[PDB]
Design a protein around this ligand. Structure first.
Ligand SMILES: O=c1ccn([C@@H]2O[C@H](CO)[C@@H](O)[C@H]2O)c(=O)[nH]1
Length: 193
């Protein structure tokens, strides 16, 4: 059903990308894995790093594609199909250009919103997965997007994102329990200050 049992974090592999805004999804899933003691180990079969563990009495899988962002579907799609995880049980955490640092929202359905990771996923499994939209801000102009998402945020913006991510971690219990409406209410209500 809508008991979240796959949590995907989008991002790029390599130390040079680890601190960039486009890896917001990785930050969330890495922190979630540490919170619940889920081992994120090499998963060559699905071109990623993945884990499996107990979150609040539920068997949950975690996935970080190691395909580079624009090829994220080349991990997520075969992984979800192999383990027979329907989109309705998937949460994908990703950076959101259309939201401020420190703003975070749970969304069900919808398009990719210009996001090149999601762009590679929705064509295959459809739109009906859940998304943890982690606000990163927009660089104003259209052609400066690459420089923004592949940039390391200033400390204040990082602090704002980190606080929002921490808040979201506290609400994963609701999501794995299938309380998507309550999780949406409580996640979306987050304020940094
Ligand atoms: O060295 C790089 C840098 C970025 N990109 C791709 O360009 C996307 C913008 O989403 C990237 O994040 C990633 O898929 C690469 O393929 N290689």
């Amino acid at each position: 059903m809508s008991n979240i049992s796959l949590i995907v974090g989008l991002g790029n592999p390599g130390s040079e990308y680890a601190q960039t805004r486009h890896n917001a999804g990785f930050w969330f899933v890495e922190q979630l894995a540490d919170k619940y003691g889920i081992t994120l180990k090499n998963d060559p079969k699905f071109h990623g790093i993945s884990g499996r563990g107990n979150i609040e009495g539920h068997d949950v899988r975690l996935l970080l594609p190691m395909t580079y962002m624009n090829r994220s579907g080349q991990s997520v799609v075969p992984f979800s199909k192999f383990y027979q995880i329907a989109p309705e049980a998937i949460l994908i955490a990703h950076d959101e250009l259309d939201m401020n640092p420190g703003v975070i929202r749970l969304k069900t359905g919808g398009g990719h919103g210009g996001h090149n990771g999601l762009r590679d996923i929705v064509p295959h499994i459809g739109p009906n997965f859940h998304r943890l939209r982690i606000g990163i801000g927009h660089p104003g102009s259209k052609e400066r997007v690459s420089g923004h998402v592949l940039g390391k945020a200033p400390s204040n913006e990082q602090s704002l994102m980190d606080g929002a991510i921490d808040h979201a971690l506290s609400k994963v219990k609701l999501l794995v329990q299938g309380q998507v409406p309550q999780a949406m209410n409580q996640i979306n209500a987050y304020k940094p200050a």
